[PDB]
Amino acid sequence: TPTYGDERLLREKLLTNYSKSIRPVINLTKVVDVTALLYLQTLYDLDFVNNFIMARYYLGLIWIDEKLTWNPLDYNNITSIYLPKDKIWTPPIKMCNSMDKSEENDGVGELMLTYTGWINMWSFRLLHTYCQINAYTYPFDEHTCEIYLCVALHTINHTRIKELIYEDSKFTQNYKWDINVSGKVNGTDELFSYAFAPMYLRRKLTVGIIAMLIPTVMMTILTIFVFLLPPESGEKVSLATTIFLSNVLYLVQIDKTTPTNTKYPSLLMLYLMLLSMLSGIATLGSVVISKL
Amino acid sequence: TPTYGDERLLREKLLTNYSKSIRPVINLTKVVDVTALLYLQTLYDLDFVNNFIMARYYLGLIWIDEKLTWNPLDYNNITSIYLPKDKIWTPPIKMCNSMDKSEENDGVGELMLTYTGWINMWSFRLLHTYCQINAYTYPFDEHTCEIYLCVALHTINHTRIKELIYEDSKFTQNYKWDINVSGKVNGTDELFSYAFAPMYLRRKLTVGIIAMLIPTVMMTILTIFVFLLPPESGEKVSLATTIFLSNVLYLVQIDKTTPTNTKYPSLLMLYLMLLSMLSGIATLGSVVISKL
Amino acid sequence: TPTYGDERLLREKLLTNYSKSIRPVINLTKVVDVTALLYLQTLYDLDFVNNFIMARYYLGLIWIDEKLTWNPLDYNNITSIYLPKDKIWTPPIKMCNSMDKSEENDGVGELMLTYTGWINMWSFRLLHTYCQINAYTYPFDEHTCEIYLCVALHTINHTRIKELIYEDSKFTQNYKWDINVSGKVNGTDELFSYAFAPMYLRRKLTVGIIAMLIPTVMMTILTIFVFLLPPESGEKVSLATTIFLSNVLYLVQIDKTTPTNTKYPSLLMLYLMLLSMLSGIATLGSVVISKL
Amino acid sequence: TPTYGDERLLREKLLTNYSKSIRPVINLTKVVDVTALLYLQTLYDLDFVNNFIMARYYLGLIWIDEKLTWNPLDYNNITSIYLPKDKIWTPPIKMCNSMDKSEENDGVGELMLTYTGWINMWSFRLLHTYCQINAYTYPFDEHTCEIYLCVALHTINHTRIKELIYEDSKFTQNYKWDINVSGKVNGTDELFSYAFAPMYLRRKLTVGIIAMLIPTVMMTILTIFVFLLPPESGEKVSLATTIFLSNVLYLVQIDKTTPTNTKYPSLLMLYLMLLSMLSGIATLGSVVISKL
Amino acid sequence: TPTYGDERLLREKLLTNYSKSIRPVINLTKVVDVTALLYLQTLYDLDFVNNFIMARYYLGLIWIDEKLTWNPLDYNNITSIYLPKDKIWTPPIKMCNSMDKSEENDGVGELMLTYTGWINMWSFRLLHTYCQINAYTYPFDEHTCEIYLCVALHTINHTRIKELIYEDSKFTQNYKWDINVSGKVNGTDELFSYAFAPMYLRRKLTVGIIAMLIPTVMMTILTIFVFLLPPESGEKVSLATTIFLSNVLYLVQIDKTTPTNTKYPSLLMLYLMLLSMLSGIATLGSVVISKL
Ligand SMILES: *[C@@H]1O[C@H](CO)[C@@H](O)[C@H](O)[C@H]1NC(C)=O
Ligand SMILES: *[C@@H]1O[C@H](CO)[C@@H](O)[C@H](O)[C@H]1NC(C)=O
Ligand SMILES: *[C@@H]1O[C@H](CO)[C@@H](O)[C@H](O)[C@H]1NC(C)=O
Ligand SMILES: *[C@@H]1O[C@H](CO)[C@@H](O)[C@H](O)[C@H]1NC(C)=O
Ligand SMILES: *[C@@H]1O[C@H](CO)[C@@H](O)[C@H](O)[C@H]1NC(C)=O
Ligand SMILES: *[C@@H]1O[C@H](CO)[C@@H](O)[C@H](O)[C@H]1NC(C)=O
Ligand SMILES: *[C@@H]1O[C@H](CO)[C@@H](O)[C@H](O)[C@H]1NC(C)=O
Ligand SMILES: *[C@@H]1O[C@H](CO)[C@@H](O)[C@H](O)[C@H]1NC(C)=O
Ligand SMILES: *[C@@H]1O[C@H](CO)[C@@H](O)[C@H](O)[C@H]1NC(C)=O
Ligand SMILES: *[C@@H]1O[C@H](CO)[C@@H](O)[C@H](O)[C@H]1NC(C)=O
Ligand SMILES: *[C@@H]1O[C@H](CO)[C@@H](O)[C@H](O)[C@H]1NC(C)=O
Numbered sequence A, B, C, D, E: 001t002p003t004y005g006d007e008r009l010l011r012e013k014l015l016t017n018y019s020k021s022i023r024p025v026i027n028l029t030k031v032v033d034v035t036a037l038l039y040l041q042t043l044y045d046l047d048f049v050n051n052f053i054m055a056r057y058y059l060g061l062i063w064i065d066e067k068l069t070w071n072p073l074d075y076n077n078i079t080s081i082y083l084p085k086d087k088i089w090t091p092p093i094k095m096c097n098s099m100d101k102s103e104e105n106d107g108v109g110e111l112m113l114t115y116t117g118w119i120n121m122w123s124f125r126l127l128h129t130y131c132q133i134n135a136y137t138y139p140f141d142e143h144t145c146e147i148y149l150c151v152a153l154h155t156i157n158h159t160r161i162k163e164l165i166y167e168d169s170k171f172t173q174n175y176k177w178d179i180n181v182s183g184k185v186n187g188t189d190e191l192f193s194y195a196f197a198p199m200y201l202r203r204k205l206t207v208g209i210i211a212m213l214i215p216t217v218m219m220t221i222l223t224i225f226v227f228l229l230p231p232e233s234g235e236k237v238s239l240a241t242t243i244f245l246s247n248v249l250y251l252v253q254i255d256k257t258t259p260t261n262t263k264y265p266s267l268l269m270l271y272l273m274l275l276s277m278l279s280g281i282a283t284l285g286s287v288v289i290s291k292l
């Protein structure tokens, strides 16, 4: 059976002439094909004001090393070892479109290496990644966030992202967003290889949200009613003033929470702007009638 | 008696052929059984809006090293030494479901090693760990937060979490949450070993909270009274308007503080939505009667 | 006179067989007695909502090393040297009850060593330390915050906190809190040595605070006056509504700022809750009289 | 074809007598001309209250090394290698006018070196850079933000910024700001070389913004109307009070969001101050007429 | 002319027997006189609530090394070299009264050394430094902030701060604060040398501020007018209630923004407290007259 001394001998011979900074290819003219595996774990939040999405992923990177190989029968059937991540060449993949707010560094850890040269380098990653969030169809709104991977400095004739396999682990259920992160895409070659996973996010219709909407609907009905009220009823000016006040309160409230960076504005927000304008027109009619 | 030179000799012989990256087993076919001890210290806060719980734990890790052994009679009865945490193999346990906001790194410290090979590696850990917080039964609400431990990259045929012993140290009393973190659970094997401690949190009924509720109750009584008030009393429209205003003020207030990510909405919030709807219906009746 | 070469020779002989990880005692059966000196510098703030106190201290640690000694007459009267903090054994003292938000690491610096073995290791430390803040007697409120020191992993038969000498440096005057941090306490032995300094904090009565109170007092007088107002005066309902509004505005305001984690609620807050209830009862009487 | 052993030999000979701290020039009397390439990627936000702009750039640095050269025919046509960034001399360029909030250190990475000595050192950089933000012509406002580069400590007779080439990558479209970052500028020599890229930012006129203004315009019309209303209409005092309230609500609202550090105040804010003053004058006229 | 090999030889001989931790003096009885140069660059903000001032300085430190000298004619006229900051002894100067929020560590960089032994160690530093901010004379308020330098652990017989030369670089104009940071001061010897630069800050009177004041003045005039209004006018109670509401709105607003830690409270705040008290007295008179 394999022993501690056997693995020690294997590692000692394995790392004899290894340069961490020289790409791991016998012939330097060939590229190293990296296939990345980005399994989402949890979608913590979707910050509308800052245009970010906070999530934790299980970024995986797989490639082939041609210098790190061995006949396992020559080492008592040792088929795999674990190496410190900072002793071996690692492709310079970065979360190109993201602020990596991770708590561990990307050079402290361990990777799994197989006797054929295949390296697995699973790594956890908490990302604050930029998304262009359009709150147009709120609250029945959808969004598309692209999580980018790209090599840092290597050219496509040196290192390439062969493929990007993105899935969802289903660790937790959200109850606020319906996440749809599935599919395979080849890397895009434009001087530096890079790929992106499209994340589709649909807000789930919660009865808390529908209840929060209900006040808006009944205020619209009430505004219509007071606008239809007889000019000589006597309550015109009073209810027009009080409900213009309340309308402006909700307009300020929503406007301070709606994203300011959208391709189009929020339909609901504009519908409440129209409501406030109609309340103002009702007040105008009331004062005009009162003076005349 | 044991001396400084004796411990120096012991350490020098002990670390002679030790590889930090080779698992500590004579035969590599055997697994290293890690038993984790997670004693809670303080529950700083339960952030509802961010769906996190902030606490400080005394994470402990115990396993057995088969290479680090000695006959203590051969070294003047030295029964235990202290080694720097980064010189010895350490299982790659991570707070899988947590943002480790600790201030010290997880590779700077010290561990206690016993002559039989048993290693104790107590470590402090301040965690911002994700919890699905349902504010349904507020303020008589309960919650279940699972604190996850899982090996980072090792397979179950290499490293396993034998057990998880979680308790509460009682360092401090909360006065806001009743914490119930006690029990033992075996590790779960699904390609990577992992376990979780269930933390049950019950909000303690404080008289500050009951006093905060009292205004809501008296506003409900007052709304019922004004709704029952005679249409021809003369105060109908006035009190309906003013109390619809105040109702909406409390509705906005609570809605901006209630969690938006819940399996069900807050019953109290929906009860105040119903109160606001009834106030609106009272205003509708008042205006209808006033015009007719 | 002592020279650079003399100190170089001294250090070279001093560090010859020193192991940073072996406790500094000739006989390992004896404990190392550490006396800690915690001089407060400034009390930046007392955050009520987060239950923390922010301050900057001059944590000092003194112990005796039995391996690091020399006859000063043998080295041209060199009586003390300065060593890098990470080359020498340092007791593993941690701010057990604190989030060390310091900006320098605890392994980068310098310590003063004397020819008798005595080590001084003064270190600055900015702490966010947990305190159970009870806002009961606000604004004439007092608090007790205990700053904890405890060894990280060493047993009481290896390392002990001999004493804790805590004082105040008086660097700055607060004008908001009266600080009383003075006294000496022996360490407490419960498997791991530890001690704590009690910090008493009394809010200083400022005329800004008394002025902030004045509105509350005059609102109480005014509420009493309107409650005593004749039912048939005609201003009853109007002033009851407007002053219930303003009362609720201040009640919401204070409740959003008062700590939610207190042994008892704030007396002033409950007195304003009673004020709001009395305003509601006045409104109830007014509407009842108006209908009848 | 070039091989791993060939590149190993090349690097071994290349780094034989290289001192990272000695400037890379054969004759020390000559300067190293550094040309910097600052390609903007995304303009995350423009924080008005803090006077900062948050963006992510692709800072590039190019210079010539006279010690790191080779005849590529002597090494099987190896024309370029990749070196770790901390093994080679790197010009001490700093984001002089910026808080570098990047997540990777500036001494961990890789650079591209060519057989003629030319070094490319592309590096990602997320910057919180100070800008003097004048909200005068809001919301048709423009701004000029200068991104500064300057050598840290080297004199102009040692290191110089030859040129600064700044462009925009167009990675993402903003929809909130029109960015115009293009042009070439020579470095400025004043004891320490330095250059700056001028960034012009024009707020794009969105229909969400125009809708947000619409309430202000109709309130101005309504204030004019009520000011023109007959003194004896009977609604003067009522609408003057209610609309002074609402005016002050919007004045407080805008004033709490407008930058306090501007060369001139916001015209729109001052126009609404004038609106509030006119409402106050209307109230003055109403009360004066009512008493007389 | 000097060459790369010449500088390599110089550095190799220079660092032969240099100990980074032994003070750089031939005779250890002499002190090292450090003169510090603190040139301010920008005053980002003055945070009133947290009692801090955020600025970026060009902290410089100059002293004399007696071991690092050379005859420049013996090395082809090399008159100065650049050494890595962590290879040479560096005085342990700390921003004693500040939270150093800098992004680079204080042991990564470079210093300029001259053939006579003189070392220049210019370093950038972004500081969050504590200031006792008294908002008494707001908005015509002044402040004095002292930026402290002190040696960390060395005694005055080992290391001293000879002088502190503080100036302003004028990099940017503030438009909000008039900064006056100029002068020279000797170090203060009280067991540990230390000095401080006094920074005087005067708020510049902006027309945005005067316009923001204008509402307060017109509300004072209006309150005087309504208080003078005839008891039997009929608008007394109405305007007293509405303007007590608005007064309390501004009182709450200012009180939540004024610093709570001041030697004396804000005069303007207390003048508005008096305004609110006068409004309350007017309401008291109105209700008393109405009942009687
Ligand atoms: C490693 O390289 C050295 C040259 O530096 C050579 O002598 C040795 O034979 C090589 N060994 C292997 C296993 O490639
Ligand atoms: C490198 O190129 C040569 C050229 O013939 C080829 O024989 C060799 O197989 C290549 N290396 C590998 C690992 O295939
Ligand atoms: C080596 O180990 C593998 C692991 O499954 C096993 O299938 C194989 O039979 C083993 N071979 C020998 C020669 O031990
Ligand atoms: C790879 O591409 C880069 C730029 O695209 C070029 O400079 C380099 O010479 C190329 N290398 C090879 C081996 O083709
Ligand atoms: C996810 O999106 C893709 C592309 O829009 C679609 O084909 C697929 O059906 C979606 N899946 C779910 C579960 O929504
Ligand atoms: C992606 O790459 C594979 C491998 O060369 C190729 O077969 C396939 O056609 C490419 N395109 C897609 C859409 O998979
Ligand atoms: C340690 O390993 C070496 C081989 O590198 C061997 O010569 C030596 O005897 C070993 N010593 C022990 C104590 O195992
Ligand atoms: C390793 O396996 C062999 C196989 O017989 C066994 O004799 C030996 O005891 C095992 N090692 C240990 C430490 O038990
Ligand atoms: C060794 O130390 C242990 C510690 O309790 C003690 O019980 C034992 O008697 C000692 N044995 C010898 C031989 O000193
Ligand atoms: C352990 O499991 C992994 C995957 O489950 C497998 O690749 C590996 O060969 C296994 N090793 C042994 C010794 O069974
Ligand atoms: C804690 O929870 C468990 C399981 O729900 C229960 O058996 C136990 O009684 C609880 N203990 C306390 C103190 O609530």
Ligand SMILES: *[C@@H]1O[C@H](CO)[C@@H](O)[C@H](O)[C@H]1NC(C)=O
Residues within 6 Å of the ligand: B186
């Ligand atoms: C847990 O593991 C132990 C040890 O093998 C076993 O005896 C026990 O049955 C397992 N299950 C539980 C619930 O303890």
Ligand SMILES: *[C@@H]1O[C@H](CO)[C@@H](O)[C@H](O)[C@H]1NC(C)=O
Residues within 6 Å of the ligand: C016, C017
């Ligand atoms: C230090 O220890 C070594 C053994 O490693 C010994 O040969 C030497 O004499 C010791 N020197 C001193 C000064 O203790």
Ligand SMILES: *[C@@H]1O[C@H](CO)[C@@H](O)[C@H](O)[C@H]1NC(C)=O
Residues within 6 Å of the ligand: B001, C026, C027, C066
């Ligand atoms: C250690 O113990 C022995 C036992 O007699 C004693 O003589 C010696 O003095 C002790 N060491 C010290 C430093 O006192």
Ligand SMILES: *[C@@H]1O[C@H](CO)[C@@H](O)[C@H](O)[C@H]1NC(C)=O
Residues within 6 Å of the ligand: C077
């Ligand atoms: C050694 O230095 C101390 C320092 O005060 C002094 O008192 C003493 O006389 C000196 N002794 C000699 C022999 O120099």
Ligand SMILES: *[C@@H]1O[C@H](CO)[C@@H](O)[C@H](O)[C@H]1NC(C)=O
Residues within 6 Å of the ligand: B079, C029, C155, C156, C157, C158, C191
């Ligand atoms: C010290 O105490 C620990 C636990 O309290 C024990 O394991 C250890 O054996 C003790 N050592 C001595 C020398 O008494």
Ligand SMILES: *[C@@H]1O[C@H](CO)[C@@H](O)[C@H](O)[C@H]1NC(C)=O
Residues within 6 Å of the ligand: C180, C200
């Ligand atoms: C500090 O508190 C202690 C204990 O409560 C008391 O004896 C002492 O007089 C206090 N000192 C001051 C200055 O308040």
Ligand SMILES: *[C@@H]1O[C@H](CO)[C@@H](O)[C@H](O)[C@H]1NC(C)=O
Residues within 6 Å of the ligand: C186
């Ligand atoms: C503290 O320790 C000292 C030293 O042994 C002892 O004299 C004293 O009685 C202890 N207790 C107190 C309260 O000081």
Ligand SMILES: *[C@@H]1O[C@H](CO)[C@@H](O)[C@H](O)[C@H]1NC(C)=O
Residues within 6 Å of the ligand: D016, D017
């Ligand atoms: C490098 O410098 C050494 C002197 O330290 C010299 O002997 C050697 O020849 C030099 N080699 C090269 C390639 O410059």
Ligand SMILES: *[C@@H]1O[C@H](CO)[C@@H](O)[C@H](O)[C@H]1NC(C)=O
Residues within 6 Å of the ligand: D026, D027, D066, E001
């Ligand atoms: C350095 O100066 C000498 C002086 O003549 C000159 O010949 C030489 O070419 C210079 N070095 C380089 C790299 O040009």
Ligand SMILES: *[C@@H]1O[C@H](CO)[C@@H](O)[C@H](O)[C@H]1NC(C)=O
Residues within 6 Å of the ligand: D077
């Ligand atoms: C070296 O490589 C370059 C790369 O394009 C090629 O153009 C040139 O012909 C090659 N020369 C030799 C001799 O291989």
Ligand SMILES: *[C@@H]1O[C@H](CO)[C@@H](O)[C@H](O)[C@H]1NC(C)=O
Residues within 6 Å of the ligand: D029, D155, D156, D157, D158, D191, E079
């Ligand atoms: C370069 O300039 C600095 C200051 O401007 C001066 O001290 C130094 O002597 C100059 N060096 C040369 C080689 O001119």
Ligand SMILES: *[C@@H]1O[C@H](CO)[C@@H](O)[C@H](O)[C@H]1NC(C)=O
Residues within 6 Å of the ligand: D180, D200
């Ligand atoms: C950018 O600004 C420059 C200088 O103001 C101007 O010449 C150029 O036309 C501008 N370009 C765009 C696209 O606005």
Ligand SMILES: *[C@@H]1O[C@H](CO)[C@@H](O)[C@H](O)[C@H]1NC(C)=O
Residues within 6 Å of the ligand: D186
């Ligand atoms: C900038 O530097 C270049 C290179 O010396 C020079 O030709 C040019 O005149 C300078 N000025 C401008 C505006 O480009």
Ligand SMILES: *[C@@H]1O[C@H](CO)[C@@H](O)[C@H](O)[C@H]1NC(C)=O
Residues within 6 Å of the ligand: E016, E017
């Ligand atoms: C440096 O110190 C060593 C002793 O460690 C001595 O032999 C050598 O001569 C010294 N060299 C210089 C230049 O001082």
Ligand SMILES: *[C@@H]1O[C@H](CO)[C@@H](O)[C@H](O)[C@H]1NC(C)=O
Residues within 6 Å of the ligand: C001, E026, E027, E066
């Ligand atoms: C050190 O002191 C001696 C005492 O006479 C003196 O001669 C010498 O000059 C001093 N060192 C220096 C660098 O002045």
Ligand SMILES: *[C@@H]1O[C@H](CO)[C@@H](O)[C@H](O)[C@H]1NC(C)=O
Residues within 6 Å of the ligand: E077
């Ligand atoms: C050395 O360089 C300085 C730099 O200005 C110059 O003034 C001096 O003449 C030079 N001397 C020699 C001998 O080269």
